Amino acid sequence: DHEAHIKVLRGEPTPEEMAALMAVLASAGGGPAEPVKKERNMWGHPVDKLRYSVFSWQRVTLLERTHMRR
């Protein structure tokens, strides 16, 4: 067991106060956890709009890396 739990550091609520608290906190939860449906779409990415010198090293370290990083 290595999840970080909610801790009541001070105070001792009754079961009904604990239930009210946890229901409120869960309603205040951040919604869906993360946007797992996010999809890669590199069309018109800003790095493709830059002018690069034909001998520019940023062709390797900026342009190519941005296209290839996954």
């Binding site: 001998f55 520019s56 090293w57 940023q58 062709r59 390797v60 370290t61 900026l62």
Partner: protein, 172 residues
Amino acid sequence: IRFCDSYNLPLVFVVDTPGAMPGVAEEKGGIIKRGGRFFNAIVEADVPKVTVIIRKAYGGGYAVMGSKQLSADLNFAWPTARIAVIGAEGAAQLLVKRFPDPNAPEVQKIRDDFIEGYNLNMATPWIAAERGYIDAVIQPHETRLLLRKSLRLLRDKQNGPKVQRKHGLLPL
């Protein structure tokens, strides 16, 4: 260094060195070319480079261990840092070999007073700080969080201008 650069790992240099090892066996073992490759690798690399000097940074040790002049990005020193071309003892020998002999404690006194003056005025953080060869002299307890701040800033470093070509040439 070359491996870390290929895999985009930032480099942290923690410096406390008199520099290259002197001696005939080191010369014959190729210390010039191996130090050359060390200098080459550190300038070649594109990753963020941050340096913390703890005591000694003499000569080639200063230069190679992520000095700003060799393209390190951020340079910090603890107040114990000593940045110089040569240590006090080496400069003292260079001085006193001009006297005919250590013929009396006169020469000892001359050495000791030179060494005191040199460790107070030369081999210090403060000249390099005045000139901006190092970006800051810091209290040692700052180091961990300062490295966090620095490498957050440097996260997206783009190294240039550099001319793309087949490759650079190492001293080999």
